[PDB]
Structures are given as C-alpha cells and as structure tokens.
Amino acid sequence: MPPKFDPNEIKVVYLRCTGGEVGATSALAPKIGPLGLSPKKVGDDIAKATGDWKGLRITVKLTIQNRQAQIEVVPSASALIIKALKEPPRDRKKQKNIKHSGNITFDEIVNIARQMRHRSLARELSGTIKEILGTAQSVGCNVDGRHPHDIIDDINSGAVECPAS
C-alpha cells in the first residue's frame, strides 16, 4: 500500500584539489580502479569544471553514475559525510567433506542389497557391508561411523527388517 521509489546506483566522491590538473584523486583511485572507470574522463571533467582557476581552500565534490562524473563545486569547506554501512550480497565459499562422494552409510549398502542393484550388492551381505564400509573408512577418516565391528554387529543384529530402511 505505501508508496516507494526505485533506488539508483549513485556514488559520491570527495575531491580536494585546486588548480589545473587532470587525473584521479585519492578516493577515485580505490573506487575507479576496481570499478573500471576511465580516469581520463574524470580528470577532463574536473579540469573543465574548474577551468575558472578556482583555488582558495575550496572543496569539490563529484557524483559518479554509469561512468559519468558530474562535478559540483561548493563554497567553503567541511562537507558532510555519511556512511551507508551496507554492502551488496554475495555467495560465500566454504570447504565440504563431500570430496569424492562422502555420505557413506550402511543404509545405502542395505538399500542396494535389498534392491539387488549392481552398486553394492556384491555377494555376501556381511562381506559387502564390511568391504564398502572399510572402503569408506579408507577414503574418509571421519565419514560418519568408522566402526565396522559395531556396524556388522548392528546389521547382523537386525539393522534391516521388512523394508530396506
């Protein structure tokens, strides 16, 4: 219900330099550098904007939008400053224990054993469970449960009943 407006990508840069000189200022270096803006355009805009030979303790501010810089000159100095305190969202990066495959559980062995699929059926239930689980321990030092004795003990005890799980 409430009204709203779409935001625009506007950047504000503070420039403290007087005289005829072209180039990028201190803020422009770290901003324009990664932005990919052309410093020549900014320097030319600054020189043309301040081509009146302004030099008396004055602060110049410029607005950057779509590689277009607008030069605004205000009298005196001590310009206001504000920080958004917000940054654009991005995807984080982290390590995973998946590696080759991971997620090895006796349930999987039981599932193929009951399904009779050629994945971990092998021959004997105990032989295949121990073999696959043993392989899991070799590939992962901490896959989930590196206890073959307990696994076969639990499997033999009655890990699977009517359903495969």
From Swiss-Prot:
Subcellular locations according to the entry: Cytoplasm
Modified residue annotations for Phosphoserine: S38, S165
Chief location of this protein within or outside the cell: cytoplasm
Maturation and modification: Ubiquitinated at Lys-48 and Lys-83 by RNF14 and RNF25 in response to ribosome collisions (ribosome stalling).
Keyword Nucleotide-binding: no
Family annotation (InterPro entries): Ribosomal_uL11, Ribosomal_uL11_C, Ribosomal_uL11_C_sf, Ribosomal_uL11_CS, Ribosomal_uL11_N, Ribosomal_uL11_N_sf
GO MF annotations, alphabetized: large ribosomal subunit rRNA binding; RNA binding; structural constituent of ribosome
CDD domains on file: Ribosomal_L11
Chain residue numbers at which the record places covalent cross-link Glycyl lysine isopeptide (Lys-Gly) (interchain with G-Cter in ubiquitin): K48, K83
GO cellular component terms attached to this protein's record: cytoplasm; cytosol; cytosolic large ribosomal subunit; cytosolic ribosome; extracellular exosome; focal adhesion; membrane; postsynaptic density
Ranges annotated as spanning the membrane: none
Pfam families linked: Ribosomal_L11, Ribosomal_L11_N
Cross-link (Glycyl lysine isopeptide (Lys-Gly) (interchain with G-Cter in SUMO2)): K40
Database matches in HAMAP family: Ribosomal_uL11
UniProt protein name: Large ribosomal subunit protein uL11
Source organism of the structure: Homo sapiens
Lineage: Eukaryota, Metazoa, Chordata, Craniata, Vertebrata
